[PDB]
Amino acid sequence: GSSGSSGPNRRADDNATIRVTNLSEDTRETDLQELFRPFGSISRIYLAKDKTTGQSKGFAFISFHRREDAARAIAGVSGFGYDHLILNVEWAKPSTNSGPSSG
Template identity: 40%
Template sequence: MKNLFVGNLSFQTTESDLTALFKGVGQVTKVRVATDRETGRARGFAFVEMPNDEEAAKAIAGLDGKAFGGRNLKVNEARPRTERAPAHNSSGGGRRPGGFSNEDYREAARKPREPRW
């Protein structure tokens, strides 16, 4: 199986539209149009799975740059999904990476401070 990235899609493009388009150049295993989790609207890109490298190469050669839905498609091999870094803990604290922990605040509160006059 070979996964292709299809970008610069019209927001009205459906999985059926892409299936029909890609079937013109080879066999299609699966199509998934990316949508916004909250609104359900298309995000302008999709992934198309082809059964092998040959079919995928034909699809890239035949469809990359082709006008579809009023836009020029970007079709290339999809990159493998990378692991996301954990969300940054931004609890304030200026430039300190990761912000201040509760213990940091307690320690700062224990230190005597000069009065600000």
């Protein structure tokens, strides 16, 4: 069970953002940069960290440049064998919409 806390107002409606959960203690930003690289060039890599412990909470958020490169990961990372475990990934934003403007 992972607490469901939130603060950083992240209003992503178009930008490429993906969420990650079930990470390891040996999984840092540099470890993810090479994991989501095979898909393309990552723009930013966020990782949940504590202030009292100063460690990796367990989840992270990778930001892609294009909508395709971002999806490429969510598809692969899904069911990956990271640290002998089942990594979890999903679009940071909800699928409320059903096809935005075309162009």
